[PDB]
Amino acid sequence: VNSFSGYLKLTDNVYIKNADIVEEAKKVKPTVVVNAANVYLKHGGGVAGALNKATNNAMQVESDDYIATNGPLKVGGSCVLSGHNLAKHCLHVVGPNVNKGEDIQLLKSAYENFNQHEVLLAPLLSAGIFGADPIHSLRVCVDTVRTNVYLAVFDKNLYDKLVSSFL
Ligand SMILES: O=C(O)C[C@H](NC(=O)c1ncnc2[nH]ccc12)c1ccc(F)cc1
Numbered sequence: 001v002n003s004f005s006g007y008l009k010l011t012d013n014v015y016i017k018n019a020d021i022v023e024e025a026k027k028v029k030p031t032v033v034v035n036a037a038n039v040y041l042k043h044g045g046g047v048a049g050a051l052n053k054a055t056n057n058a059m060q061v062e063s064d065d066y067i068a069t070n071g072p073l074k075v076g077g078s079c080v081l082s083g084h085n086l087a088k089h090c091l092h093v094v095g096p097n098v099n100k101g102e103d104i105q106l107l108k109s110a111y112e113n114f115n116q117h118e119v120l121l122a123p124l125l126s127a128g129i130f131g132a133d134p135i136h137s138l139r140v141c142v143d144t145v146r147t148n149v150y151l152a153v154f155d156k157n158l159y160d161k162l163v164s165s166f167l
Helices: 021-028 046-054 058-070 104-116 134-144 156-165
Strands: 008-011 014-018 032-036 078-082 089-093 119-122 148-153
Touching (some): 014 156, 021 046, 021 119, 021 148, 032 046, 089 104, 134 148, 134 156
Parallel strands (some): 014 148, 032 089
Antiparallel strands (some): 008 014, 078 089
C-alpha cells in the first residue's frame, strides 16, 4: 500500500490522475519523481520548468554541475539526481522531442528507464510541448513499464481524452 490519492487504475501496474505533478510531488513526497528532461538538463518549460521552479532553481544548479562533469544525456537515456523538496530522487528521462525532429521510436527506450525503480510519479513522456501523440505515449508506457507508475496529467482536456480512448 502506498500514499497516492484519487488515481484511476489502467493495468496491473499503471494509474493516472488529472493533477499538477508538482502538487502531487509536494503532497506524496515519492521516492522518485520523473522529469521530462532534455539532454542538457536545461529545465525551461513543461514538466522540467515546472519542477525546477518548485525547487527554487536548485534542480537547475545541480543539473548544471552534472552536465559539466558528465556531458549531455542520450535521447532515450536518464540520470538520477536529487528530488530536492519534491521527492527523494528525480529521475531525469529524455524522451524524443518531435518538435526538435527527434526519433519518436526512442520513446520505448525512454520508458525502459522507469523499470529501474519500483514506484514512480511521472508525466506522460514526450507529450505536451514535446510534440508526440499522447495516446501513443500512454500505450508505450503501459506496454513497456513493469514497475508501479503513477501518471500525473496536467491538462484536463488531455486527461479526459486519454481516459476515454484507453484500450
Ligand atoms: O500532462 C500534460 O499536460 C503534459 C505535460 N506537461 C506538464 O506536466 C506541465 N507542463 C507545463 N507546465 C506545467 N506545470 C505543472 C505541470 C506542467 C508534459 C509531458 C511530457 C513533456 F515532455 C512535456 C510536458
